[PDB]
Amino acid sequence: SNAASGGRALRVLVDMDGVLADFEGGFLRKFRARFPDQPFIALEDRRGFWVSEQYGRLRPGLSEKAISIWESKNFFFELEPLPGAVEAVKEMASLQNTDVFICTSPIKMFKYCPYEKYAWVEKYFGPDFLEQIVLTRDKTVVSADLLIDDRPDITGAEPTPSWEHVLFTACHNQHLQLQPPRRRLHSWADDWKAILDSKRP
Amino acid sequence: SNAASGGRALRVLVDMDGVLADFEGGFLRKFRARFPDQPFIALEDRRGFWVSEQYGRLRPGLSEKAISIWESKNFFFELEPLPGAVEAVKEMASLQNTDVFICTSPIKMFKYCPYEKYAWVEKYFGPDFLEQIVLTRDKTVVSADLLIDDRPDITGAEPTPSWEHVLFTACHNQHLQLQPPRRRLHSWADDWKAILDSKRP
C-alpha cells in the first residue's frame, strides 16, 4: 500500500517470466506438443538463460522451432503462475509502506506479448493492479529498493541502479554461484518478507 | 547514443501522446467523423488535461462518446506525428552520450493500446527503437535527467523524481502559468538541444 502523501514506501520490482509466470514449463509443454518428434531439454537439464541457444546446440533448426513457440498467440497469456506467486504478490502489495510494480520486458515481436502480459495481470491480480505494470527492456532505469528477477545479469543504460537485485531461483540459474553479497529468493515459499524488511528504514 | 561502458549518458524520457503523437487532433477528427451531429471542442478552446471532462460539461452523454473514440481499434496506431517530432527524436538519439526512452502510459483498456503504441514506434522509428520504449502509469519511478511531457502535474510513488519535467506545450496547457523555475518546450521546432545541454556535466 502506498505511503501517506509525500512519504516514501519501500519499492519492489517483480519480474514476470520465470518469477510470476512459468515460462520454462509453459515453453516445454508447448514445444513437446507442437514438435513431438524433436528432442527437448528437461528442466532439470536447462543451462543458460537463453532457451533457444541450448535448443540450437541440441539439433540444427531447433533454435528456430523454439522461437516459434513464444512468438505464437496465447503463449504468454496461457502461462501458469508459479506456485505461491499470486498469493505472495497480493500479500506484498497489501503491506503498509510497500509499493509493488510488475517490471517485465516484452519480446521484440510485439504482436501478442505486451497485450497478453496486461491480460495475464488482469486475470490473476484484477483490474486495479494494471496500474502497477512497467514494461521495459531496460530495468536499470527503473528506480526501486529491490528487483526480484530470475535473470542473473541485468544491465542497461544506468551503470549504478538503485535497486538491489535478488536472484529468483529458476532451473537455468539454480547452480550458479553468485558474487557475495548477492542473494537469492528460492521460490515464493521462501521468506520474501525477511528480504523486504532488510531494506526498510 | 549510449555512453562507453560503465559511463553515464544524459538520459531523456519523451512522452508519446501530445508530444510525439497528435492525440488531440486525432481525437477531434475521429470524434467529428463518428458523431457529426454532436457539438465538439475546437483545439483553441481546449481546457484541462482530460478531454472527456470538458466534453461531459458540453452536453450530457458526450463524455462516454469521447471515451469510445480512444477505446476504438486503430485510434492510437493512426495518430499522426507532431510536426518535427520524429526528426527531433531521431536526431536526439544519435547524439553522443544521449540515451532517449519513449516513456508513455497505456490507457486502462489494454486490448489495443499497448500493441498499437509499439506498432507506432516501429512505424516511425524502426525496429531497433523498440528497445527504447517504457510503458508505465507511474513516470516518477523512471530515473532520468529530463522528462518531456505535456501533462502539467506528473505524480506517483516517488516523491522526489530524478528528472526535471519540461512541459511540452499543447492546446490544453498553453495558457498555464508554471511555478518558477519550471520550463517549457514549445514545440519540436523550439530549441530542445539547449535544454538537453543545460543538464550535461
Ligand SMILES: O=c1[nH]c(=O)n([C@H]2C[C@H]3O[C@](c4ccccc4)(P(=O)(O)O)OC[C@H]3O2)cc1/C=C/P(=O)(O)O
Ligand atoms: O528467460 C527467458 N528465456 C528465454 O529463452 N527467453 C526467450 C524469449 C525471447 O526473448 C528475447 C528477450 C531479450 C531480452 C528481454 C526479453 C526478451 P527477444 O525479445 O530479444 O526475442 O530474447 C530471446 C528470446 O529468449 C526469454 C526469457 C525471459 C525474459 P524476461 O523474464 O522478460 O527478462
Ligand SMILES: O=c1[nH]c(=O)n([C@H]2C[C@H]3O[C@](c4ccccc4)(P(=O)(O)O)OC[C@H]3O2)cc1/C=C/P(=O)(O)O
Ligand atoms: O492527454 C490526454 N488527455 C486525455 O483526455 N486522455 C484520455 C484517454 C484516457 O486516458 C486515461 C489515462 C490516465 C492516466 C494515464 C494515461 C491515460 P485512462 O487510462 O485512465 O482511461 O485517463 C482518461 C482518458 O483520458 C489521455 C491523455 C494522455 C495521456 P498520456 O500522454 O499517456 O500521459
Ligand SMILES: [Mg+2]
Ligand atoms: Mg524473467
Ligand SMILES: [Mg+2]
Ligand atoms: Mg501526453
